[PDB]
From Swiss-Prot, chain A:
This is T-complex protein 1 subunit epsilon. It is found in: Cytoplasm. It holds the Pfam family Cpn60_TCP1. The lineage of its organism: Eukaryota, Fungi, Dikarya, Ascomycota, Saccharomycotina. Molecular chaperone; assists the folding of proteins upon ATP hydrolysis. Known to play a role, in vitro, in the folding of actin and tubulin. In yeast may play a role in mitotic spindle formation. Heterooligomeric complex of about 850 to 900 kDa that forms two stacked rings, 12 to 16 nm in diameter. The gene is CCT5.
From Swiss-Prot, chain B:
One of its GO terms (cellular component) is cytoplasm. This is T-complex protein 1 subunit beta. Pfam families: Cpn60_TCP1. Its main location: cytoplasm. The gene is CCT2. Transmembrane segments: none annotated. Keywords: Acetylation, ATP-binding, Chaperone, Cytoplasm, Nucleotide-binding. NCBIfam families: chap_CCT_beta. SUPFAM superfamilies: GroEL apical domain-like, GroEL equatorial domain-like, GroEL-intermediate domain like. Molecular chaperone; assists the folding of proteins upon ATP hydrolysis. Known to play a role, in vitro, in the folding of actin and tubulin. In yeast may play a role in mitotic spindle formation. PROSITE patterns: TCP1_1, TCP1_2, TCP1_3.
From Swiss-Prot, chain C:
The gene is CCT2. This is T-complex protein 1 subunit beta. One of its GO terms (cellular component) is chaperonin-containing T-complex. CDD domains: TCP1_beta (cd03336). It holds the Pfam family Cpn60_TCP1. Heterooligomeric complex of about 850 to 900 kDa that forms two stacked rings, 12 to 16 nm in diameter. Interacts with PLP2; this interaction leads to inhibition of CCT complex mediated actin folding. The lineage of its organism: Eukaryota, Fungi, Dikarya, Ascomycota, Saccharomycotina. Molecular chaperone; assists the folding of proteins upon ATP hydrolysis. Known to play a role, in vitro, in the folding of actin and tubulin. In yeast may play a role in mitotic spindle formation. NCBIfam families: chap_CCT_beta (TIGR02341). Its main location: cytoplasm.
UniProtKB/Swiss-Prot annotation, chain D:
Belongs to the TCP-1 chaperonin family. Its main location: cytoplasm. Present with 5530 molecules/cell in log phase SD medium. GO terms for molecular function: ATP binding; ATP hydrolysis activity; ATP-dependent protein folding chaperone; unfolded protein binding. This is T-complex protein 1 subunit delta. GO terms for biological process: chaperone mediated protein folding independent of cofactor; protein folding. It holds the Pfam family Cpn60_TCP1. Molecular chaperone; assists the folding of proteins upon ATP hydrolysis. Known to play a role, in vitro, in the folding of actin and tubulin. In yeast may play a role in mitotic spindle formation. Keywords: ATP-binding, Chaperone, Cytoplasm, Nucleotide-binding. InterPro entries: Chap_CCT_delta (IPR012717), Chaperone_TCP-1 (IPR017998), Chaperonin_TCP-1_CS (IPR002194), Cpn60/GroEL/TCP-1 (IPR002423), GroEL-like_apical_dom_sf (IPR027409), GROEL-like_equatorial_sf (IPR027413), TCP-1-like_intermed_sf (IPR027410), TCP-1_chaperonin (IPR053374). One of its GO terms (cellular component) is chaperonin-containing T-complex.
Amino acid sequence: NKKRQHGLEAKKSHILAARSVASIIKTSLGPRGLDKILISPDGEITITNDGATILSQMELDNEIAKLLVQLSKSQDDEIGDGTTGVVVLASALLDQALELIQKGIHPIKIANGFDEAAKLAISKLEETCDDISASNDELFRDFLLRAAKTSLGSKIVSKDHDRFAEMAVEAVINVMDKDRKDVDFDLIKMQGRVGGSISDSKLINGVILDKDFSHPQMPKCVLPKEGSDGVKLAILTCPFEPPKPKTKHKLDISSVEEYQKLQTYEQDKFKEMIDDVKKAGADVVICQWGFDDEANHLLLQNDLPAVRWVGGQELEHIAISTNGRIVPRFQDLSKDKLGTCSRIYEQEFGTTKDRMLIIEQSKETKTVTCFVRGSNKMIVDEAERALHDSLCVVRNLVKDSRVVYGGGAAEVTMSLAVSEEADKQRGIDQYAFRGFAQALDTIPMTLAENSGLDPIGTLSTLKSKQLKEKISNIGVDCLGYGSNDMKELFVVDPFIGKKQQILLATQLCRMILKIDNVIISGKD
Amino acid sequence: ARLSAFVGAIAVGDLVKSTLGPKGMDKLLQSASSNTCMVTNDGATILKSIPLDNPAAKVLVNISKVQDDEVGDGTTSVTVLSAELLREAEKLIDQSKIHPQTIIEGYRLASAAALDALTKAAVDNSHDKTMFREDLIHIAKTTLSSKILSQDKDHFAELATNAILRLKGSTNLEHIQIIKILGGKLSDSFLDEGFILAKKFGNNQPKRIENAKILIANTTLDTDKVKIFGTKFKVDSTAKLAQLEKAEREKMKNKIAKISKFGINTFINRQLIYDYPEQLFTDLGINSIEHADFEGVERLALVTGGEVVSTFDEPSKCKLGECDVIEEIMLGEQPFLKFSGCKAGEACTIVLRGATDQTLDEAERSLHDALSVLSQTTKETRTVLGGGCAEMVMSKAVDTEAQNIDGKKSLAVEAFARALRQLPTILADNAGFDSSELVSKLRSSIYNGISTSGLDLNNGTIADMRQLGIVESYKLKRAVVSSASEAAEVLLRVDNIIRARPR
Amino acid sequence: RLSAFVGAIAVGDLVKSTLGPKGMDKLLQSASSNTCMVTNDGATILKSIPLDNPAAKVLVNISKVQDDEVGDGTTSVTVLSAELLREAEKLIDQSKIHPQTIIEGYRLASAAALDALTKAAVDNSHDKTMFREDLIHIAKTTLSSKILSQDKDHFAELATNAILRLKGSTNLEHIQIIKILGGKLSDSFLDEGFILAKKFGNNQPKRIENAKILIANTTLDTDKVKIFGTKFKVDSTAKLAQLEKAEREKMKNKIAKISKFGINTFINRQLIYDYPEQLFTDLGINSIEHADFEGVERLALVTGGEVVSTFDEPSKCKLGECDVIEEIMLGEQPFLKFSGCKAGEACTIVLRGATDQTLDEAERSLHDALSVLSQTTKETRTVLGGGCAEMVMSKAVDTEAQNIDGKKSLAVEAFARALRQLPTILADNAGFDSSELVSKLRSSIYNGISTSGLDLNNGTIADMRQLGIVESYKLKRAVVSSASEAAEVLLRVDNIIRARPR
Amino acid sequence: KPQEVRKANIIAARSVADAIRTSLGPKGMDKMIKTSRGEIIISNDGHTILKQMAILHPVARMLVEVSAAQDSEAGDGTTSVVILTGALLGAAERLLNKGIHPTIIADSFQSAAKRSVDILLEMCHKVSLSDREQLVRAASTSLSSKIVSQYSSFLAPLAVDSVLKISDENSKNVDLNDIRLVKKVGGTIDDTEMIDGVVLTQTAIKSAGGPTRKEKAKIGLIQFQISPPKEERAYLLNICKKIKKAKCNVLLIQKSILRDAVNDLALHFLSKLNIMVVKDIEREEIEFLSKGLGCKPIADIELFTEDRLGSADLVEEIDSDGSKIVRVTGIRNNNARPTVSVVIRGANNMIIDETERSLHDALCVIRCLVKERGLIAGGGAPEIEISRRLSKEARSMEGVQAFIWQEFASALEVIPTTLAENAGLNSIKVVTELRSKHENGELNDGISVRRSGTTNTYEEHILQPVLVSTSAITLASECVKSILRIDDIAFSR
């Protein structure tokens, strides 16, 4: 079960495979983009326009495509923005290469050209960069928001998405420190409840997890009581109560004395264990198993809410901000072995009776977990993806104040620059540098084709104004506004992101054009 | 691509097309089990029962499943309108070469047009409270249709009308209880505030308890251990085991001491009670009820107004229930217990008097959903003209907005109206009246004034719907447009079907 | 019905691509396959393609009537009539409409459509120059479908000046078209001389002034005129020859009996023998021979002559009159030209093209255009084209749907939907986006502006009055009239019955 | 193709009626069926025919469901409801070919049915359950099938004694489980008993010393069995505390194989307690006993108390030639049921088996007279009578109602046509005479197999309860709707 094909004709097989990958992802590019139906292994129906999930759930058997996907993962992991453009641009770069192959251009002569042409394009893009953070700090916050809405207004939340941008820009403002000059995106957890509306999503200044207090007589809010070590959370596997197995018992009872004798044992272990909560230093107790009712009533006098059947990772997320520990026994617990917060309160959301638990530090917290609602279970999944992506939108805008005015205008601006350097080639490479422009044009072309605009005249419309007039942003009208000028529409992409799109795509040309054999061995 | 993608929706429409209307046709269900012979015009049963292969058709199912829980009615009209919107689009795609997004954008503009028309036709009676009551009869007159109850609808109209008039305030739907009683034609049904339970109270307690104090226990009182549950009877002599149970009887009485600590006249338990702690309830003069299920516990919490009372440590610091009359009666050929005048209870129970099980099964769904529709008419007092009028009213406004709109989008808005004109067409065909004559004569009526006409499918003509009393909900018809608007947006955006590694 | 109506739909598919000056060509392959033809001429397409569905035999015959009757609108009628059937299918399978209901609705709407063509009519009886300018704009449309798309501006003057100078009987026999090899399309010219394509005579006068013309249908070659089974078993060749010489003496007398009329030109349909011809030389008479019926039949009415099949006695016949009879050699071919003929309004269009393969099509092109222009002198009302009339028609049909009963409503709208397919076919064949251009014209005409039409050059919508695209009231009347007739026939067909083939 | 589904449903359903068409009438023909288990049955009983048929077409299975509804509604006419339905389906095929929409057909048949029921009242012979004579006359019609009709005058008032006691004229619904037919092998119909209590299939005591019965005794209704693991008698003696404390002089213990119903020694212990012993009482028979007795079963011996006992006049075992029949008289409990039981005697087991079926039919005859007071003529007289009053009035109907009601009239002739065919008379000659007799003559005229012609069925004493014809029209109109309304057949999952 191996392949046999000799000559450059094998590269025609390889490129024709890439055209299949593109025919999938192509139609997903743009805010007017078309969705894909994803058949889950279990039959679950997922509908998304996100090329990261489209490529992740895309299953193809040609190993050339498996390379294209594995390499595109680096766009999602390092940057997290335009994985879609990596595949779309690469396909066009390979499509123009197919023409170069037939013209007799040696495979390496092709690769050397795309490398030097990228050195021209990225440089000419830098000549047009702009500083989104210029002037005042309040202007930074303003423009930071104006762009964040461009990523959120493209999803189902677009009706009132400004509210998801409210939590996003304010979150990264809380999570970003200009002295640190970096944003640890793991400091933000994405979590919501199934059902609700856009206005039911909240900006939460602290940790919220899918839990509620296990006993209604315990206080829904615990405070340090003016000066204590905040609110400590007990993270244990066993409850504070007389020991009772959760599998089998097998306690032989020989007489009535022995029968009720366990209740005597329970009374001392009831008060001992609930005193061991207070002595151990827990203000609330969360254990993998629940707590005895009589212990629960003895906990009441000390205001010791508790929660049952909770996994370690969920309490870990709290323990990250509170510096808690999973101590094997309650006897070695301390004010520090049990992590500390300032306030734990249980919040009800209108008709939502879930009443989730929120852990705050009564100050600027080291972590936030924002609250997401949406009218359909699957809307919530994508809505949190919008917060994930818009979190990376502002994360890159913090990383690099340099931005480009996008919408295909930067690609056409770079395309025109490549055509300017075409006349300066006057050599064999002139064949290849020109094709780089023909490939750069496929991004604004794809943007127009997914929008319902003229696939050819749109290219001449953008090139006309970006050539005869000025480098002023002349974008694609996919948003349905009046005309071009994304500076007026405040549609902006990160500079470092577009640089990575061009450079990573060039790497894909180095990877695909330099594979001459596909040897697929069997398995024993 | 789209030849394979959108076609999945066409099948969904044909599965439900014949089920819409007062005279609808039935579908037969049968599985490989061979014993699942079901005949129903119910869209919820049909939609949930039919397995579908095309995942795009599975999308329409999930869309309508939301309609079922969100509103409880109109699930047929969502599948019909949403399918006809996609069928008109399939014709636009091939014949005119229309971009998929162009069709999506047109239905968005048309959604605003339809919402304007339904708003213009809103007729409300917050004045003339008597007419609001009559409108509730007329809304039920239309909502109670499509069922095997159609022969007895007039009786069910007054039953549901008083039920919604009984709430006379908050729209709490769980206040409504439905009892399935065998025996008699459906006209024998009656509405009673008694909140009927099928169990009695006490061992020997007086059957009429007035000014009762009801205490609910939610746990197991069969050999009720005072939190020493988990011990074993492990003795070398049988006599010792019986003594161990007497130790439980000491513990049961301590639990009964805490339960009776409240000073109660009546007591209700989720689970069964052992003769001894039950005899203690009997000896203490407490009206004791056992073996209450989820609804027994949940409804009593909403009826009697108390707690599950996990803590019996004090007569206060918790809600204790009350009932004006606890009436034990032999009614419906089954011993019934009736709680009348529960803690500030403004509710009632609807008792269905049917012939057999399958008939009561359908009336359960009919009345369950019927009051669900009426529950929205208290908050939304604006009503809509039925009989297909509103569908034709929308078709006129959509054609009106098509007068002023650009080209690529005008082809979709006009098609949107053609889809709206399929709604009254399916209704007329399922009633067996000339599907072309009736729909066209509707058009001449609505185009040349007369914004009150609709289909008289009982007599086979076109009549003033305000005279015939065919009334719809503003929210119901708005949700038909709204749910269909979102439904089309989802399916029109499908460009391919991608399969991950199947299991 | 399902097959009876659909049977004819294929006919529209054959011609749906022929509509418009930008249209596409059909390739014909003969049974021998070696005589393949490339043409966009719709009448040639419909006549050349055999069709085996009896419903198509009817529609083809319908279009043949329009070819002989009008000479234009072969595609316009065939396409419009096909779209009526394409709409009818949806009125049947998906609607459940009785065939007769469809018939009555199409008749009802055809009346309203005639009214729209009437209300929008514009005529210029005053300012005959403005009528000339409109005739130019009319020719700009009728000259389409040919390679003349490059030189159309010049052929408009060739045809407009002819019908302008006619100023008389619309008989197209007053106008002749000549195909000459050599020259470019623009090298064609208009000549008032109704040129005959042949010179005859041995030593005969080639210049005749104040001529009297005698067209002849007799035998002046040899003897035994209409004598069959007569043989000369003679012992002397003088006994045989004397009888031909006697008929030559009778012709020598008929040359004198002809001469006694006062004749200066003698035109004969048959051959004339050198000697009976030679006697004309001293008489001052140009003798023409072997002129066929096709030519002399029009000369009979252009030169105003007479047939005069019998010359046995003088003063027994009429003659023609011509101011100048001369021989003109152009295109390396001698011609016989006439000037100042009885009924002097005659003229001819002389074509000077590269090859007859191209002239054959331009000949029929101008032939049909002369037919249209002739009719516009009797019906001077004109309408705006480019789909302007078609969309104005659809506007009125919608008005009928405002006030209509229930069964006829679906049919009235179908008639309109067919009218909206007419500008659709135009746009598709022009290669533009028809979904926008049709709805753009729809919004332009529905929201006032009864001026706009399809600009086939720029792919846009503009005023037809400034762009110069106009068509006849009579042409558009025949399009919608024959269309309702075509549907009246085909919609009435329910079953196909076959007598056993012979 | 929605029309083809309806076309297929009619074609398929008509083939079911073609099976039953031959079975109508006392002289009708027999059907043989080889069942899926290999057992070949032969009989003319229509419900038996359809019960063992198991038609695989789900739409045709509805015709079987109607048959059972006819059996539970009236208890007779199980063939008349199927044949009548088939005529509506064949008439519907004509209506469909004439171009009538399914919903127009269905509602028009419903409207014609409303008048049909009224017509049945017009022909009703008014009787009452106080008419002790006609009640026997009605039974003698159904007892014409009796193998030995020399005993028909004994079973006649027997059924009356069962019902006349538990349900007089002031009554609505009679539960045929309240009259339990309990057959006993041997004897003759000279010995039948209307038992005002219950009759048990189990004997009392095989051991000596047994009470065998007790007068003025309390009835134990127990599902919990007494089963031990000195200890043998000690356990049962310890249980004797529960047996005696309840004040129970008769124990009727449910059959259970996990725990012995009555302990082996309990026969002797209860002979000291003077308690009547009955063991191995079939649970399916407890379904009869635990209900009729009016008390409630004991699921735990500790619950065996006084309130859960019956208060019987006498619980006695009848021993005649090895009978030993345990029965109760005078249940007389506050919550009791009007339970009557019939002791059936006959030549051999094959005779008493058939007798039970015929006595069940006789109770269905009276049950028809309880639900619907009044008799109608037999011999298809009501079917011809309706067709005259229907078609005579149908001339005044306007619109499509005239054509559907006229077709309904022709369908009503399927019964007298079938009765004539299976009787061997020219179908045209018979129906023609029936038309002239109902037009000019009496509504009692009909088909007589006794006289070999059409005669007065009232004079020939062929009468039937009106409920059979009213339920036939009712269920048929419901069936023809349910079949015409099937628009598609979908796989379910």
